[PDB]
């Protein structure tokens, strides 16, 4: 079990999926086509804004 952690835009999490397209999915963080696991995202305006 591995855990990656980062902070992105709110809607940009739509690009956090196996083999998607976009700036993040191609130049920042790319998931394999056979990826299996979980992706969690939560608001951080109280901290990162």
């Amino acid at each position: 079990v591995y855990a990656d952690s980062f902070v992105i835009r709110g809607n940009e999490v739509s690009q956090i999926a196996p083999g998607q397209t976009g700036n993040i999915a191609d130049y920042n963080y790319k998931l394999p086509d056979d990826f299996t696991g979980c992706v969690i995202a939560w608001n951080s305006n109280k901290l990162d804004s």
Binding site: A3, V13, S49
Partner: protein, 49 residues
């Protein structure tokens, strides 16, 4: 480059904190697992091993 994460931004630009848990579902050994425990086995009984 950065987005700025100003409070005037909406959900499209507000910062979201994301974590990606990557698991391997092979049962070769055992690293983490759920909490459960039971009794021992039987030599010549029909059991759900």
């Amino acid at each position: 480059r950065s987005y700025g994460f100003r409070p005037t931004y909406g959900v499209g630009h507000q910062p979201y904190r994301v974590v990606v848990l990557s698991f391997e579902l092979l049962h070769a050994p055992a690293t983490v697992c759920g909490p459960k425990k039971s009794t021992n086995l039987v030599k010549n009984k029909c059991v759900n091993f």
